[PDB]
Structures are given as C-alpha cells and as structure tokens.
Design an enzyme around this catalytic site. Structure first.
Site, PDB file in Angstrom:
ATOM      1  CE  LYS G  16       0.568  -9.101  -8.951  1.00  0.00           C
ATOM      2  NZ  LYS G  16       1.657  -8.248  -9.501  1.00  0.00           N
ATOM      3  CG  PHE G  62      -0.167   8.268  -6.998  1.00  0.00           C
ATOM      4  CD1 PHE G  62       0.999   8.351  -6.251  1.00  0.00           C
ATOM      5  CD2 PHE G  62      -1.389   8.262  -6.337  1.00  0.00           C
ATOM      6  CE1 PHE G  62       0.949   8.423  -4.866  1.00  0.00           C
ATOM      7  CE2 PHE G  62      -1.447   8.333  -4.955  1.00  0.00           C
ATOM      8  CZ  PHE G  62      -0.276   8.414  -4.219  1.00  0.00           C
ATOM      9  NE  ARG G 110      -4.573 -11.743 -15.145  1.00  0.00           N
ATOM     10  CZ  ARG G 110      -3.890 -10.618 -14.988  1.00  0.00           C
ATOM     11  NH1 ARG G 110      -4.415  -9.573 -14.375  1.00  0.00           N
ATOM     12  NH2 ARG G 110      -2.653 -10.537 -15.472  1.00  0.00           N
ATOM     13  CG  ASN G 120      -3.597  -9.261 -10.856  1.00  0.00           C
ATOM     14  OD1 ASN G 120      -4.472 -10.106 -11.037  1.00  0.00           O
ATOM     15  ND2 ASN G 120      -3.025  -8.597 -11.851  1.00  0.00           N
ATOM     16  CG  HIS G 123       2.849  -8.637 -13.731  1.00  0.00           C
ATOM     17  ND1 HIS G 123       2.151  -7.571 -14.254  1.00  0.00           N
ATOM     18  CD2 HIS G 123       4.111  -8.531 -14.211  1.00  0.00           C
ATOM     19  CE1 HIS G 123       2.956  -6.849 -15.013  1.00  0.00           C
ATOM     20  NE2 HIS G 123       4.152  -7.410 -15.002  1.00  0.00           N
TER      21      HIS G 123
END
Lengths: 46, 239, 51, 46, 181, 145, 201, 75, 78
Positions: G16, G62, G110, G120, G123
């Site tokens: 990220k 969303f 994480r 985050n 992934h």
C-alpha cells in the site's frame, strides 16, 4: 476453394497465434491476436 | 568510460597523460549522477575532452536500452551544468569541412569560413564516434528482439587474440559488428600494453587523442578521447 | 577554478600539443607528454623537392 | 458457410494438437527439473 | 435516425503522452425492454487511450443500445480536447515550449530547463542569437506518433523577451557602447 | 522434496528485468520446438532454437544516490591548503585518497563561506557504526556563530 | 494435479502507498518466511485503473475513499510462489480491520504496518480464481497454471474469439489481397467487438 | 499422456555422434549450473551457460618478464 | 487610421535618442524616444489620417565578441 487458400496462407502461424491466445488471456484477445500477427510478420519477413 | 573507471583514475594509467583532475573527477561523478537522474539513460559515459583555447570542453554521452541507438551526447564547460547537444546530420557534417582551425571555447563563437561552434562540436563528435569508437569481442550481445544489450557474462579478452587485430569492433551500426582490420588505412591504431598484462592500451591515429583501456581478465572497457579535436589526414605521412 | 585562492596556473602550449608549464610561481616545473609533433593549423604539406 | 465446415474445425484441431505438444514439452521439462532436483538432493547430502 | 451526441472531453498532455485509461459516464436516455428504467446495463464503457493521439480523434461506439423504432443510436465519446498545460502547447506531432527570458540573459549561452511530460529535466543550450521570432529544433522528444509509440516527435523552444524598464542613464550611456558599436 | 521442487520452479518462473521473459516458458518453447521437428544433431541446434524462440504507468525508482547527488550539487557551486596535506596523507598509507577528501575540502569551503571562521582546518575523521563523522576545527573571528 | 505434473500456486502481494517507503524490511519478512519473488512492478494505480481492478469489491460496495487512497502514491505488486501459499499468506498476513488486528494478532503484518481499515498495510488475494484475475489484470503476459487443455480452451476461443475470426475470414476471402497478414491485422484492429473504432486526423 | 512422456524421454535420450552427449544430460548439467542461487536474470545467459558446459601460461609470461625487469627498482 | 512600422535597431532601442517618423502629408517631425521600447508598445501622435500610430520593430544583431559580450553583461544583467 477458399479453404485451400486459408490452408496455404497462414496455417501454423494462425495455429500458434490462437495457441497463445488460449494460453495467455488478455483483456482483449483480438488486439493481442493482431499484435502477434504483426510480430509473426516481423519474424517471417526478416 | 563509466563513472566506475572515473573512480579508479584509469585515464592517467592508460598512458595518454592528458588525463583528468580530481576537480573534474568529483565533478563528473556528481554531475553524471545528475545526468542519469534527469535523463533516463540506461548507462551514462564520460565521453572525453575537446582541447580548447579559452575554455575546456567536457563531453559525456548517454545511451538507451538499445546499445546501438543514436546517443544523446552532452557538453559542459564548468563540469556541473550539462546541456543536451543536438543530433548530427550529414548536412552539418559537410558544412564544417570548410573550417580548419583549433577548437576555441565559448560555444556562441562564429567562424567566417556563418558556421556556429556548437555545430562544429556536434559534427566532430559524430565523426569520432563513427570512426574510432571501440567495442571488444563479446562485450555487446545482439538480442533477437532487435536491440543490443550489454553482455553481462562477458569474460575478458584472452592474451592470444589481443594482437591480431581482429578482436575489436565499433560502437555504431554495422561478433555482429565490423572489425578493426578493415579500417582505412591499415595500422592506424597504436597497439600497446601497460605494466604486465593487466591493461591493453589502444590509441587512435586517425584521431590523435582517444585511448582505449581494456583489462584482459575483467569486464573493464571504455573509450575516452582527450585531444586536439582534429582529424589529421597527415597519418599516411606518419607511417 | 572552484577554489581559486590556492590555484596553480597551468600553461598549455598550442604549438606543441601536450606541453605544459606550472605555477605557484615561487618555483616551477616543465612537463611534456604527447606524440612529439608540432601542431599546424593546416595539414602537413610535404617539403617541396629542390628546383 | 465454407469456413464453418472447413478451415475453422481444422484450425481448432491443430490448435488442440499444438497445445498438446506445448503441454508435453512443459511436463518433460518438469520431469527434467524433478530428476535434477532429486539427483542434487541425493548427491549433495551424501 | 437521430444524430449522435459529440461530447467535448479534455485530456491532459501527460495523459496523451502515456496513454491512460479513462472512465466516462454516459447519458441515460435508452429505454430498456422491461419499460421501467432508462439506465443501460453498461454504465461505464472500457476504453484504451493510445499514446499520442490527435486533437480531435473521433471514437465511435457503433450500434450502442440498439433501441428505437427506426433509430440506431451511436455515441461519440471522444472529441479529444486538451487542457491548458502551463508549459507545453501541442501541435500535429509537435510541441512548442514557451519560456520567459530576460534581455541580459537571453543573449547568452542560455540554460533552458525543460521539464517534459516524462518528468525529465531537459537542459537545452541556446548559442545562436535570439530573435523575437526565433525557435530551435530539439529532435527525438515530444508526444509520440499514434502509429509509432516508440519513435517520438519534436520540441520547439520559443522565447518571450521582457525588456527592462528601470535603467538609469549611466547604463544607457554605456549601452550606447554595448549594442551600437 | 516438493518444497524444493516448487522453489526451483519459482526460480524458473522468475521474470527477468531486462527481457521480460521467464526461463521456464523459454525452455518449454525450446523443448516444444525440439519435439515438433527432430534433427539428428539435437545438442548443436540449441543455439538457433533458443534464438528463434526469443524472436517471439510503470514508475521509475529514485536511488539514495540521487539524494546524495542532490546534496552534493552545492559543493561544486581562510582555509589552509588541504590538497598538499592530502598528498602527504597518502605517503603514510593514510587518509581518504583524493575524491572523498576533496568532497571534505568542498564541505570545508561551504562551512567557511557560511560562518565567519578565521581558521578552518580539517581535524580528521571519526569512524562510526552506521554513519561517518567529518570533523573540522573552527576558530571564529568575533566569537559568534 | 496428477503424478508427473505439479501445481505451483500463485498469489498477489500488494504494498500500500503508506508503506512503500518501508519496503525493504517487509521484503526481508516475506523473503525470509519462504515466499519467493517472481516479478516486482512499481506501478502508479490510476483512479480509473483501480475500479477495473476492484470490480469484485468496489463494484457492489460503496467505498470511494480506498479508490482515492490507491492513487495517493506508488503501489508495489509482486507474485509469490510457496507450498500452501494462500494458507501461509493468510496466516502471516492475518485478518483485516487492523485496529482489531493490533489486539488479536500482534505478530501479523497489519498490526505493525497498518493503521485502520481504509489505510491498510497490504492486500492479498483470497481465492485461487480471484488470484488468477488479480494477476491477469495487474501483470503482463505470464502463464498461470493450470493450462486449460482439451475442450476448455476450445470453448474459450469458440465463444470469445472465433465468431470475430469467422467474420474476419469471411471478408478476407473476397477479395484476395497479397500478403493477407496486413488485411487480417487491419480487420482485427478495425472491426474489434471489444474495442471501439478509431479515426485519426 | 504417459506414452507421449516415454516417447519424448526416448527422443531426449537420443545421443549425437558429432558431440558424444545427448540433449537430456546437457539440459541436466545446464539446470545444475542454473539452480545454484544466481540472480533472477538467467534468460539472457541460458545460451552462454550452454556454451560453457559444451566447452567443458605461455601467453602470460611477458608479464612475468616485465616483473623480472621491475624488481631491481627497489633492491 | 493610418499607421506604419519603423525597423529601429536594438542599439537605438534601449538608449534614449531621436527617431524620425516622417508623416506622409507635411514633412514632420523628429520626435524623440523617452521610455524604453517594448515589442508590444506604441506611441500616440495627434493629427489626421483616424490618428497616426507608430509601431516599433526591433532588429537584433548577429555577431558579437567576448569582451563586447562581457561589457554588455555589465550593461544589462547588473
């Protein structure tokens, strides 16, 4: 016949082009097919 | 020559003796790091020096992924401000043939024989690069993709075929390049060795001032031209 | 040229390429390295045969 | 009309045969890899 | 047959340099078969921008929707307009760079720091004299051709000369010797 | 054995940063072209078979050398003569050579241009675990910074 | 799957843009654990490229803040091969919601390199088909096992390619131009069903 | 198929009279030189390792001679 | 509106002097220049022609000497 014309025209080149189309699956297989047709031109001419 | 050979101070050890200063060694190290930063070259080489009358010319060249591509050569006077020279055409190559005289400096200088000084510098650079640029055997690998890459498994030239002269190519468009045995005239290269068999020294005689070092057991090579900036056509009278 | 207070003046002959002379100026040394040839602005014209 | 009976099913059959040849080349390469790794394990540890 | 819509859409110079994919919303005036919603099932259409297109290439969505009694609508999603880039303004296979300059500095072995669309700081010198109507040739860089991405265009460097306005007459008296002689 | 098999295959599926091809797929195409047409000299045609197989918004990464080339730009843009002292360093088998001590001398020049220093001589170097120390004696004229 | 073949599975490791500057330490972790680096891509994820990459999650949920988050900096994508790569990558990676994962799995990636849900640490792909889709979208023309031998690839060509190939070869017969590779390539780049028509000026 | 496996293994096991080695042992030695921990760019050098495994004093004595002449400089 | 373009050299451009914009009717006058001329700049002269306007075109030199250049740098860049 036109079948013999398509037999003698591409043959193994179109076979290999559809082989890597079936092997490598892009977002648009038509564009990759045309790009490998151009690359097969550049291989068999030079 | 790359910046690695600028670290070892190998221009003086080649024996040409016009050489380089730690002034210019540190300046070329930092400024060619800048040249590799701003322009996305694969490799950046200090090309050499053109001898001046009021200022000294410092020349470096950059290369793309294709090793035989037309280079984007650069010039600098105070050894920090590198500026991109234009590419050379044949129309500028036959333009500067009517000007015979020393390289002066101050690149806005004008020749009455108008003709700009920068055009003379660029055409002289293309003449030296097309004539006496040097690549050894197996240094460049012709990839089947159509581009040329640096051969990274290049074992250095053995001592049997150092003196043939059929083991050195040109760094331009043509073992797929043209050898040194077809150069006109024959014997226009000063074949030499350093102390021991540690370095092979090649000096061009069609252009007095280029030196080619080559360690025969490692992957160390490169050409630096520091000299007058003139093609002597007096060379058949010399030999 | 970067640090000019402790500079040394480097002479550079254009008649003989590779010929230099040096300062501080309290003492001096002379050095030459080249092909041992005098520079000419034109090409080397051969000497004419005697009449 | 002629292509649906002629050149296209022969092209699919040749593409299947070429993918069979590519698959058999991949698995004999994998067999060579397995033989090399097994021989290196049995030889370097003894 | 209804005429198609022609939407003027703006792309940046670096986007035309690199060829980034764009997501564009469309109109919702196509009746469905259920006769309850006017929204097409393809809300966003997947495109691919080639690097170095012309200002105004026509991209046609031929037979989009296929709804109507005798009307087959099409969508011209690309009328390629270009945003006002602060450095370069393009032309056919060309880029001109307009760069400000002072009169005491224009006459020099100049330093033109050109930050191109590839984030490359080009340093191009000027050693000819600088006319008001003066341009230079920097080959090998520009936006690439739409047929050849690999081979590039040309850069032209234009100059805007700003004359000084606050010269006290000592520099005018010796500027009589600095230009006339 | 299977872990080493998958490690060797992941070795052979790794993509080179120069050509963009994997070694496993290249050798698979080489063996496929070998098994398609079979000459007698199978070993000696491995050059041309491998050469014929080869016919068929990515960011750029900044080095730390880019950052130190940014910091060392300003070096090139009342001291004692460091250079004869550096020539006398090398006869003892001692010192930074020429380039690193010249960057030291340029940093000394920048320090002398920044601060009103009467005498700015190179004290020396202190070796460290992660970073070096470059030490200069400074004598101020008015005693201020 | 069978005895003389092998199954070297793949997974995608995403770095990220908050943690791309700390890439060497996490690279030491993922190389030292047993995962291998196939190819690393330093890619700037466009906002118009993140949506087509995340049709599986963003297309039904969303969440535009993560879409703006992937365009805030560089993104490093890598392919991993390991014995039980999915299970060991889920064990080393740990579950999501890094505020809770800082307390439930303190040795996870994480818990150290992450801050919250949307910002985050990493992934990872969950399923094998999702891994195949993620690898096929981000990475160039690489081969992912299994090769679909037999009738699997023939159906793929016969319902994805060969209608367009039949329409191309129908017009290629009448008339007959010399060197028909030009005509086939121009027909495929012109009469493309998945790509719109192009008109240069 | 396993019959194709046996046919391709017999094809790779066939030797050549011009070299004395077959393709299978040549590729096995190539993979032996590959599988040691080289950096992952062996695609360009897979040929050069094949020439290296296919291939597998008097020219240096001038350096010895100048080293004979050079040792009297400091003695 | 009647107007003409005078090709004033750069030597008389940056220095205060007198210029000769002769009208086409009554042979007048030697109007001097006071401010430093710009490429996009005009003066205003009363009369009838519909008033007269003067546009100035700057002619640049071509060849220069290094000392000439350095004393031009002391002229302009200081």
């Amino acid at each position: 016949m036109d079948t013999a014309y398509l037999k003698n025209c591409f043959g193994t080149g179109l076979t290999q082009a559809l082989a890597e189309v079936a092997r490598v699956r892009p977002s648009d297989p038509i564009e990759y097919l045309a790009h490998w047709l151009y690359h097969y031109r550049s291989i068999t001419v030079a | 020559m790359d910046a690695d050979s600028l670290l070892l101070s190998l221009e003086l050890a080649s024996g040409s003796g016009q050489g380089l200063s730690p002034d210019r060694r540190a300046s070329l190290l930092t400024s060619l790091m800048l040249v590799k930063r701003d322009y996305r070259f694969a490799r950046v080489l200090f090309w050499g020096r053109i001898l001046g009358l009021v200022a000294d010319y410092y020349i470096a060249q950059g290369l793309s992924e294709d090793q035989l591509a037309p280079r984007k050569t650069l010039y600098s006077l105070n050894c920090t401000e590198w500026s991109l020279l234009p590419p050379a055409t044949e129309e500028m190559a036959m333009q500067i043939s009517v000007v015979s005289g020393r390289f002066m400096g101050d690149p806005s200088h004008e020749y009455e024989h108008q003709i700009k000084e920068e055009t003379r510098l660029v055409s002289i650079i293309d003449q030296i690069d097309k004539a006496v640029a040097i690549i050894p055997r197996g240094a460049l690998f012709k990839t089947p993709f159509g581009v040329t890459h640096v051969n990274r498994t290049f074992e250095g030239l053995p001592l049997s075929e150092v003196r043939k002269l059929s083991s050195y190519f040109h760094f331009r468009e043509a073992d797929f390049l043209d050898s040194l045995e077809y150069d006109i005239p024959r014997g226009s290269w000063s074949i030499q060795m350093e102390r021991g068999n540690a370095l092979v020294v090649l000096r061009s005689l069609l252009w007095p001032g280029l030196t080619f070092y080559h360690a025969p057991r490692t992957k160390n090579y490169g050409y630096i031209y520091v000299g007058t900036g003139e093609k002597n056509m007096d060379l058949p009278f010399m030999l | 040229n970067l640090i000019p207070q402790y500079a040394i003046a480097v002479l550079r002959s254009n008649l003989w390429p590779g010929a230099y002379a040096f300062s501080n100026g309290k003492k001096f040394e002379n050095f030459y390295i080249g092909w041992g040839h005098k520079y000419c602005v034109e090409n080397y014209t051969p000497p004419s045969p005697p009449p | 009309r002629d292509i649906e009976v002629g050149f296209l099913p022969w092209l699919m059959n040749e593409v299947e045969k070429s993918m069979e040849h590519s698959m058999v080349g991949r698995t004999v390469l994998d067999m060579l890899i397995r033989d090399v790794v097994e021989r290196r394990i049995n030889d370097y540890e003894h | 047959q209804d005429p198609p819509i022609e939407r003027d859409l703006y792309l940046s110079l670096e986007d035309l340099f690199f060829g980034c994919t764009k997501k564009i919303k469309i109109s919702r005036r196509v009746l469905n078969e259920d006769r309850y919603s006017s929204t097409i099932k393809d809300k966003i259409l997947t495109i691919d921008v080639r690097p170095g297109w012309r200002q105004g290439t026509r991209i046609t969505f031929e037979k989009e929707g296929d709804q109507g009694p005798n009307i087959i609508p099409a969508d011209i999603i690309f009328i390629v307009k270009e945003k006002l880039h602060p450095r370069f303004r393009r032309e056919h296979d060309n880029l001109f760079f307009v760069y400000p300059i002072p009169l005491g500095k224009a006459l020099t072995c100049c330093t033109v720091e050109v930050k191109t669309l590839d984030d490359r700081l080009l340093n191009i010198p000027i050693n000819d004299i600088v006319h008001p109507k003066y341009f230079k040739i920097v080959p090998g860089e520009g936006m690439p051709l739409p047929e050849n991405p690999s081979k590039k265009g040309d850069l032209f460097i234009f100059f805007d000369i700003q004359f000084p306005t606050r010269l006290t007459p000592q520099k005018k008296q010796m500027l009589r010797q600095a230009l006339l002689t | 054995l299977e872990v080493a098999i998958q490690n060797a295959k992941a070795y052979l599926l790794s993509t080179s940063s120069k050509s963009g091809l994997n070694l496993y797929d290249h050798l698979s195409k080489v063996l496929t072209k070998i098994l398609d047409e079979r000459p007698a000299d199978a070993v000696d045609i491995i050059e041309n078979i491998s050469q014929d197989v080869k016919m068929a918004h990515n960011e750029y990464e900044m080095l730390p050398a880019y950052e130190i080339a940014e910091t060392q730009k300003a070096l090139f843009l009342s001291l004692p003569n460091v250079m004869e002292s550096a020539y006398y360093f090398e006869q003892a088998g001692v010192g930074l050579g020429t380039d690193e001590t010249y960057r030291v001398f340029l940093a000394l020049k920048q320090l002398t241009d920044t601060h009103p220093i009467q005498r700015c001589r190179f004290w020396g170097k202190i070796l460290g675990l992660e970073m070096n120390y470059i030490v200069a004696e400074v004598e101020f004229r008015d005693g201020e910074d | 799957m069978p005895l003389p073949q092998i199954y070297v599975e793949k997974t995608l490791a995403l770095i990220k843009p908050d943690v791309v500057d700390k890439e060497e330490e996490i690279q030491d972790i993922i190389l030292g654990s047993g995962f291998t680096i196939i190819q690393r891509r330093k890619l700037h994820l466009s906002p118009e490229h993140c949506s087509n990459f995340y049709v599986e999650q963003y297309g039904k949920m969303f969440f535009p803040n993560l879409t703006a988050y992937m365009s805030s900096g560089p993104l490093v994508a890598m392919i991993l091969a390991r014995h039980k790569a999915i299970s060991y990558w889920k064990e080393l990676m740990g579950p999501s919601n890094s505020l809770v994962a800082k307390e439930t799995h303190p040795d996870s990636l994480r818990a150290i390199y992450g801050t919250d849900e949307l910002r985050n640490a990493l992934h990872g792909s969950n399923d094998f088909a999702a891994s195949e889709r993620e690898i096929r979208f981000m990475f160039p023309a690489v081969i992912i096992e299994p090769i679909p031998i037999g009738q699997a690839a023939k159906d793929y060509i016969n319902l994805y390619v060969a209608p367009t190939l039949l329409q191309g070869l129908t017009e290629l017969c009448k008339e007959k131009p010399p060197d028909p590779y030009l005509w086939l390539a121009d027909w495929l780049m012109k009469n493309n069903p998945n790509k719109p028509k192009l008109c240069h000026f």
